[PDB]
Design a protein around this ligand. Structure first.
Ligand SMILES: Nc1ncnc2c1ncn2[C@@H]1O[C@H](COP(=O)(O)OP(=O)(O)O)[C@@H](O)[C@H]1O
Ligand SMILES: Nc1ncnc2c1ncn2[C@@H]1O[C@H](COP(=O)(O)OP(=O)(O)O)[C@@H](O)[C@H]1O
Ligand SMILES: Nc1ncnc2c1ncn2[C@@H]1O[C@H](COP(=O)(O)OP(=O)(O)O)[C@@H](O)[C@H]1O
Ligand code: BEF
Ligand code: BEF
Ligand code: BEF
Ligand SMILES: [K+]
Ligand SMILES: [K+]
Ligand SMILES: [K+]
Ligand SMILES: [Mg+2]
Ligand SMILES: [Mg+2]
Ligand SMILES: [Mg+2]
Lengths: 520, 520, 520
């Protein structure tokens, strides 16, 4: 289609105007005295949220150029989210603050491509400075604090995540789901979503569930319909005394019917449950179980009959628990060599996962082998969704603090790094201005946090810069102090990520001399 | 449809106005103090780029005639790209500079078709003059410099490409891909795009790949479905101790199933992978592998059964590595006589290749026998794509410098050729003006590079023309000197290509007396 | 009326756009390779002119703010004209060149009010530097040159003005009028536009005019109708032998009739002519004549009867010449003390003249007492008016060169002053930039002159700045040399005036932060 082509200052002013709309919608949520944004949503109720990327993703403007602005800087907020899990607002605030200052310089005749070089150099330095300030965070108290700050000063959420990480470990997974109840709730566990096929198996009507004591485990890839196939293996289990769990694609009536009357009487004690999953993921998951239990997958496709299985090919576990909905294998016989080998394999399967969905289900399986769920409570569903948005962010920040330490929040970390790089210079004057652009931008987070409290950002910034180390402004309490003592901890990973991504995009955006888009 | 028909000056003014929009969008990216262009893109985020053809391809104007202008001159930028790989902006700048000057002459009553003859003559001369100035470029230092200048003064990219060409050789291929990491990365290897057929073969779950130590290699032209055919050869490998790779058209279930349970247990260690390619190219490539490994292709078509193969007909290698996507044969037993004989054969197959596509896949195979990938690092994805655009350009220029030498950059090469052709005349006055049009256009690259630094192009041009040999303007450092000493090298091939293509199109465009297009 | 109010950058961009239209229309006429502007004019034929103020005065723009721009800077061109008489284009070119550079600085955050202080300081210095370079110009050759350059390289006009000033002196007046003839023409002369009332007075039918030898002169304020009033004075003249001129408001029939028959016969020799002027100007002019002739105005209003006059109250002259159209008094008896006293009185009457018309008729009378007329020749009337416009400008420049010396033209004078003030600084950085703004503007005249020749202004500017003293570019001949040797002389007064006035206005214009005007 015919294009509209704009040059130079015109193009840039438009590009900025756009950036500002997105920026300005996201910045209002920054900090403890941040407010929420309402995002209309065609199919049903609107969404209230504080989560900066969520606001960002919705912005799309009418004017084709302004839109381009907003659509590029949207990537800062968006990438922060994909790497860190928090800091998306901060990232957005920095980006704006660079772009704005940089473009002002470009308008003064300075060479954009050098302004970029400056910015980038200043940032590579700032990243290293932040790694210096970073003190690690591994005690449950510190984690609870990060969690708390991350969930907009909600101590319960901190406490609850800290408890969760304590219980699953660090090689263990935590999910968040909508609760049915009005208050928050933590559940901890290998298990999968499949119940008994035969309700006449429940050997403990107390719980309404089957409790097989120290049983064998048969892993059938194919779906079973005839009892003929079972007889060989069923025989060896009947003369072994131990019970048996059968996890095949399905246990059909003809072969199910029998199995029932056999446990009915006490000839063998057997359970039947469908296989966890669908398609290639099922065979993959079914294999995971074999490794945990020391059994062989009896895959009909790769040249095995179900009749030619023996006790050899059966897995074993310490105990098994199956109800109407879920099956649980407690402590399988499989050797931890084979297990961690199988895990470091699935760990690198998540590396080559180019899609988010391919990553979800993979780390689910590694947790089953190396798991907790937080249920979020709220009165209504508008409430549910802002809360659940904060819990996720919190969890992410906690995992990030663990893996890369913490720094003083309230945007002070960045303000310090800026004073430490006060002597940084480049190859020429334009690059210098470029550095100074970035350092001045490093103040923006603190400045905006203060501005969302309706207090004079210049005055607070000055006072924090007059101090040392972890002296900062506590925006919630409206007085100064030691940010680490007051529990105001940002993960290093997030603060770093915010800065790197803002710089990457904003840097390039300053180099714009022409814009090409479709006509209206 | 009904047409709008315009004549003479009206038609030309429109045609120019169009050229200028495209030209003017591309010219802003020229040179080290060049800036970037933003190209909106319907499905997701916009693109920032310096790459002149990329900008050009997007231009399409509303006014039906102006569009025609832009759509014709778009071919200069586009063809430069397809032949050279760099110089697309330069090409575009020349084209404009001719068209503009030529049309001005046409308006003065001079006979276009002669102005063309002049231009073309001046260019045929300039091409030869450039071949004189060309000094070859074969040491890694010179190549790194071309690479560097080509990637807008990014020394890492130069260094990295220079290292690459040093390692793959000159009969070896280099690709560029998006990196996962934040910094640039070079990987070097025979390999082909095929994974294991049987995921139950991975003998090292660390990498999630099969690592067959010093194995035999079976090359089956036909597709396998029955284990009967394998037994004779499988037998001799089972009593030899060494593992076996099977590279046939396909390993079907019945014959696959078995092979699995055999390595499953440790009876033989075998891998199964499809054959690289399709049709006649497959048999050709399958044969290449036989030569590298000292094996025989067991081609069912030319009177061989798979059962009548023995250890005799199997290839051998030092090591084999196969994952989900690719199979690699490290250091095959095949004798280097047979190999280089097979290569000098495929080398002359590329000579008779009259189509580009027939040339692509052929030199791919010669590289497999005589390969590297550069992964580009960046923070975000907007960044990734401008960088990856520069790396490709750089690589192209380096390969072009190697094959046709270098000349002084900063557009001086052309400025010299213009002073050397100061005595060139034609058959009549109009042809003379035509020559002078081209020579004056030869200054444009330097002039625009200087103009993107915001300095007086006339003043710099004068000063460079006052000098000799490789005296030029260094736009980055803003002072004059010896361009070769300062590492400012353009490949001859690109400078030549730019000039030839601009001239070809612009020449014709000057001959326009009528334009016919659809009504609005 | 309701106002539109614009602030800051918006207001300034508009203001500039306006300046540029006016500037851009005037700048095209600068220099020897300057072109002409056509100004439409409601009542009849349009006007072709080179005269920069004439173009300026017509510019008025539609957009209310742009207009304000143009309407303010119009004053530069206009004031230059009222003080100097030439340099109006130059003045306009400087003004633009300041405003443009200054506003660019204002946009960079520099404090306008300081930029002004800088500019003004740099100019006060430049004014003094110009007075240093000024060499006086008093020989007819130098004046002819100034005249020539001023009339766009028309040697005749130079020659002709030089001749004129040589003949009238420096205390003598030169006017320019439309000629009837096709070629230029100079006439030299106290006289006024009144013929004899009585055609029967002509005492020399050769010329058809009255030639009264060494006569008395009667100055009657009132209009005469009765011969009674005359008898007393007529008597004393009849017994004195000398003739008599009668310059009253009118000589009515009854008193005219008689006077005729008296000279008819030879009783007295008398002439009768109306008084020069109308109303208060008549009595004023009639008084001028009394002073030149040593007579008394017989004013009926201030208590004098015409009968009570004697030979006492009559003026006297060496000779008198009267024809059908004009009366001339050659060399009156009045003492030069009384004359120059009367002149230095009328000289200060022109000082308090706040209207142009009050100034016209006053300097006419001072010329009658302290005269030459140039008649301009041309074929048509479009031609007449561009030529007459150049002659006036030339005359002005010549009178200015005489009173304040000359400097090297081609705008070099200013370029030198700029290199001499290269060390000038202010009280702070913004003031420094302000100085540099002015010095850079000083190059504009030369740069535009060169640009109207279609040659590279940067290249010429550089080459002139590389030289010394009066080395400059001769735009007419297209080669460099000594501007004074080549006769390319600008009057100091004009070059100074241009600079001062541009600076005054442009200085203020840079301080604009808000604009208030009526709605559309
Ligand atoms: N009580 C507080 N005083 C000052 N700063 C705080 C306080 N609580 C949180 N913050 C800071 O405000 C920032 C707000 O983060 P948030 O608004 O969730 O946006 P983001 O997407 O950038 O995490 C945190 O980095 C934290 O440093
Ligand atoms: N530092 C420098 N000084 C002067 N010229 C340079 C410098 N670096 C690169 N160039 C020149 O500028 C040209 C810019 O090429 P580029 O802008 O990528 O457009 P193209 O598509 O024509 O390669 C190169 O040919 C090179 O000669
Ligand atoms: N032959 C020449 N070469 C260079 N400069 C010239 C020549 N003739 C005139 N000039 C310069 O050009 C200027 C032109 O004056 P003009 O165009 O009449 O505008 P203005 O209203 O400023 O006098 C003069 O100041 C003179 O210095
Ligand atoms: F805006 Be962040 F994700 F808290
Ligand atoms: F514009 Be080129 F491809 F560097
Ligand atoms: F424009 Be000037 F009065 F010659
Ligand atoms: K937020
Ligand atoms: K380019
Ligand atoms: K003029
Ligand atoms: Mg947060
Ligand atoms: Mg290039
Ligand atoms: Mg003049």
């Amino acid at each position: 289609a015919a294009k509209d082509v704009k040059f130079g200052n015109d193009a840039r002013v438009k590009m900025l105007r756009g950036v500002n709309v997105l920026a300005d919608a996201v910045k209002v949520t920054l900090g403890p005295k941040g407010r929420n944004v309402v995002l209309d949503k065609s199919f049903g109720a609107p969404t209230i949220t504080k989560d900066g990327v969520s606001v960002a993703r919705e912005i799309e403007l009418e004017d084709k150029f302004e839109n381009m602005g907003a659509q590029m800087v949207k990537e800062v907020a968006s990438k922060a989210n994909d790497a860190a899990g928090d800091g998306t607002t901060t990232a957005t605030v920095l980006a704006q603050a660079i772009i704005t200052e940089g473009l002002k310089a470009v308008a003064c005749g300075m060479n954009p491509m050098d302004l970029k070089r400056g910015i980038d150099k200043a940032v590579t330095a700032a990243v290293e400075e932040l790694k210096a300030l970073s003190v690690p965070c591994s005690d449950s108290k510190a984690i609870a604090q990060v969690g708390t700050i991350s969930a907009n000063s909600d101590e319960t959420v901190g406490k609850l995540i800290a408890e969760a990480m304590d219980k699953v470990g660090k090689e263990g997974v935590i999910t968040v789901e909508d609760g049915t109840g009005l208050q928050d709730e933590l559940d901890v566990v290998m298990q999968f979503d499949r119940g008994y096929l035969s309700p006449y198996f429940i050997n403990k009507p107390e719980t309404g569930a089957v409790e097989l004591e120290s049983p064998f485990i048969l892993l059938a890839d194919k779906k079973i319909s005839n009892i003929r196939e079972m007889l060989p293996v069923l025989e060896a289990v009947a003369k072994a005394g131990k019970p048996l769990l059968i996890i095949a694609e399905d246990v059909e009536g003809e072969a199910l019917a029998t199995l029932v009357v056999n446990t009915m009487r006490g000839i063998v004690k057997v359970a039947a449950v469908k296989a966890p999953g669908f398609g290639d993921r099922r065979k993959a998951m079914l294999q995971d179980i074999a490794t945990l239990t020391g059994g062989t997958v009896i895959s009909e496709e790769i040249g095995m009959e179900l009749e030619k299985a023996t006790l050899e090919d059966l897995g074993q576990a310490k105990r098994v628990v199956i109800n109407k909905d879920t099956t649980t294998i407690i402590d399988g016989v499989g050797e931890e060599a084979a297990i961690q080998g199988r895990v470091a394999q699935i760990r690198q399967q998540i590396e080559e996962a180019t899609s988010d969905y391919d990553r979800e289900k993979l780390q689910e399986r590694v947790a089953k082998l190396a798991v907790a769920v937080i249920k979020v409570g709220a009165a209504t569903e508008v409430e549910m969704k802002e809360k659940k948005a904060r819990v996720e962010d919190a969890l992410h920040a906690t995992r990030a603090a663990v893996e890369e330490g913490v720094v003083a929040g309230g945007g002070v970390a960045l303000i310090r790094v800026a004073s430490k790089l006060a002597d940084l210079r480049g190859q020429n004057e334009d690059q210098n201005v470029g550095i100074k652009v970035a350092l001045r931008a490093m103040e923006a987070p603190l400045r905006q946090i203060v501005l969302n409290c309706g207090e004079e950002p210049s005055v607070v910034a000055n006072t924090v810069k007059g101090g040392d180390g972890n002296y900062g402004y506590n925006a919630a309490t409206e007085e100064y102090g030691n940010m680490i003592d007051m529990g105001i901890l940002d993960p290093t990973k997030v603060t770093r990520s915010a800065l790197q991504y803002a710089a990457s995009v904003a840097g390039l955006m300053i180099t714009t001399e022409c814009m090409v888009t479709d006509l209206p």
